[model samples]
Target: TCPFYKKIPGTGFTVDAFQYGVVEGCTAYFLTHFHSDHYAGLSKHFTFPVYCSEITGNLLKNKLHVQEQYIHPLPLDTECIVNGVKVVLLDANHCPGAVMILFYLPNGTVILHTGDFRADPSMERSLLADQKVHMLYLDTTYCSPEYTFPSQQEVIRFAINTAFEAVTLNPHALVVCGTYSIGKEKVFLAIADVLGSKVGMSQEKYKTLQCLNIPEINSLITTDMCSSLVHLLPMMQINFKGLQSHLKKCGGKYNQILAFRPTGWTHSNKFTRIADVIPQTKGNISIYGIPYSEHSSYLEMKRFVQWLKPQKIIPTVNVGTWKSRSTMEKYFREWKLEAGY
Candidate 1:
């Protein structure tokens, strides 16, 4: 068995055998969420008996195609002991398979790890119901003044309004919206619900949505070809490019085409540049900036950490230049506490 290195201060010298060796007696290894960053080093970093929520484990096995022999799956809010550590998996509203963890150690030191989560107050109350948590390793990706994210309801509203506006402005023009294959597929479903039509989803997106098995969003709008009067809503700007090229190949007027960029472009301020790069009938290349985002904003991140009242807050995945480690550290410092693990 190897020793667990103390990178962050106060954890003290310990030999948990987490990072490298299987020294036996290593308690538990948590799979916080199914996101790439959290699960990236799993198969190689640690080999202790793996423990996570059923949704997260199934996501790793079924979606990412990684199988491990020692896997224990738990349900939402269910507390269980793994290698003597009391572990609880809570639903994280950021994605379908996301989870926040509460790990109760042998010495009664409870550690709450919020794995790449957003500010869904309802989700917070639902998951952390009447539980007294100690340390909190928070998702501080957006702990900067520059970072901002509109609420989910607002994002959906803006996207729907933009799509409707595009349709109204040019009845003959084909409008396509950009979205990702995974979580952003829900955006398309939202659009479809508003439009009362099924949006065409890729096979991968379809599988993801099907796995969710939500009754309200069972279908999306799709079409093989754009009719004389056509409105296409893709999940992201990446898909928008291909469809735009196809439309150009069919010799449609470039200026007549309008593509609504996804929420990220607006957040990162790349919509204008992206619109300029994409080749289409050169009539009016409009890149509309809609207030939409999946992640929590800087204010929300700060609020989340404050509410959790953790001993220390650690940022999981950094976003953009502003929402970096230093940003989170600064916020922690402002809270009148030393920043550490």
Candidate 2:
């Protein structure tokens, strides 16, 4: 949907804008990660070159049936010349194969496209510290003062402790953790390691995750739901009724459900403190709507932009709606001023 919005104004390059196939001047397609929202309109039948990280390339070829002939897996932190354009990949920290792409055009202008990333402070010491960036194509998923999420470490620790406590309180309760296509791997991994509970996942998803080479994953996964007390379900299936029915089908020692629905949507400004992550503990279902988001929080994004101090900023998310669009750019104006750009 953001095809037009994703196309860089002055280059033949487009970032995750595949749906609008063969846009006026695009020569190459670069997928940041395998997320459906980002790789919206890509089909297996394209002839043009597609570039992504080596890990993402594996998922792209298998999951989407993208041809290897079209895929060019770039090395991490290494630059390659693609049809005269210099590009490199940096760990996005959003998912296993995710990367923040950096493009250096022939005119000496630098463009850094952050494809759905959780910004980390460690980036301050990277090559980004030395580059004179002209434009920063930002992931403005949570660009408002109202949207502030605790760090993933804090949330992961919370999930592990919460799962352990829940399982201890009711030994027979089935633990369910919600997941997305490519993110939230850390949360489930930490919980499983702590609880010693094998993860039950779909066979196909299990195979795709292996591409990332998540350590100790081979020992932790189980296709048979009966083998594991903790199960991984997609974001769509985390509902009370669904949980009850899923439990009903299991028909075992499981008496109640302990579900951890982790996503940024669960967080709002109403909860004034980090400890105020609300959970619904009515009846047999105790659902913890933990704010375990992969995207950077408002302050994280601000701090990143302030550090980079790019000459210009482009709002990536919330661009379709003019009202929301203007709100994001206005913040950018202020953020740029703060960066002294």
Candidate 3:
């Protein structure tokens, strides 16, 4: 039943502030990532010092306008003490600068807060080897059995190939990508690199990418729409009504507008999932939803829980009474029982 902010039972340190007003009582705050949802109510006005990865610190300063003095860089795989609690940061494998927090309490309780991560074999070998997690805050975004998705690398490859085919079929067509403000930069970068063209974005988004210090991706940012054949717009632009209006505004400049969304939601039964891509067309817009996600799937989550063998599992999202700790335990018990584990 732990919310976004968790106070150590005996320590003064708090992890992650949801509302701006919650920073007063905490000795220190830990930020898992720079995503707006996780970073809710944080802004330039933030006065409390925040601990996060170097990249996230930079983004907080440059993108979110948080003062540099208030941003503390917590390097990966390094241990530090905050209010007498031993804390170590590890890669979350969800997005750039995302980290999972491990806290060693004085009472000998090892708490693990997995702040939105995708399960990875290398991470398990490096971080979780022989580690005992007493309390686990899990990322259960796709906790149901139906939400299975391919690996991000495979999905990215599929996206690149599909984009290439779409561009080949219509040379003058603009490749519009649906993405969040921060996540899915990999898809955009890969598409730009493979297509040998710059991807146009808003000036603000370009600045955000610049703060990331990715040379290849930073160099591909273009403000002029006509400067490149591919345009990297936000996910909102992929809507049918928005796409129609945008194409009409272009006035036949492009032969077509091919939009692709790389997300895990395509795995839902509502969407028609094909072998490679899910197509949804409206007028001149051809939208394909690719299943490229950073969050863990059901099978991944099951495997991660089994490997960690946490004493308790607490879901971080959609945590109503129905999805409580007892519910999660029941789900896990059924899964393990069914698997004969």
* Cα lDDT tens digits for candidate 3, 1-341: 33543554556566666565754457788889888878877889888768889888989888778998888897788779876778899999888888999888898889888888998767778656856888888887888777777777877887788889878887877788876667778887788778888888778777777767565655777887777767777788788887777777666788678887876755353454445355788666788777777898888888877777777666776676664556666777876565564
Best by lDDT: 2
For model 3, name the residue pairs that clash.
Answer: none
In model 1, the Cα lDDT at residue 292 comes to 54
Each model's lDDT comes to: 0.55, 0.82, 0.77
Identify the runs in model 3 with alpha carbons over 4 angstroms from their true place. 1-5, 23-25, 248-252, 267-278, 323-326, 335-341
Listed in order, each prediction's TM-score against the native is 0.71, 0.93, 0.90
Tens-digit lDDT track of model 2 for 98-179: 9898888788889999999888899887778877889889998988888877788888888888889888888888888887
Q: Residue 196 of candidate 3: its Cα lDDT?
A: 87
Model 1 bad stretches (over 4 Å): 1-29, 41-50, 68-71, 127-131, 168-175, 221-241, 248-257, 265-281, 284-291, 318-327, 336-341
Q: Give the root-mean-square deviation of each candidate in angstroms.
A: 6.3, 2.0, 2.7
Candidates 1 and 2, the one with greater lDDT: 2
Error of 2 at 63 (Å): 0.9
Point out the worst 10-residue segment of candidate 1 by lDDT. Answer: 6-15
Total clashes in model 2, counting residue pairs 3 or more apart in sequence or in different chains? 0
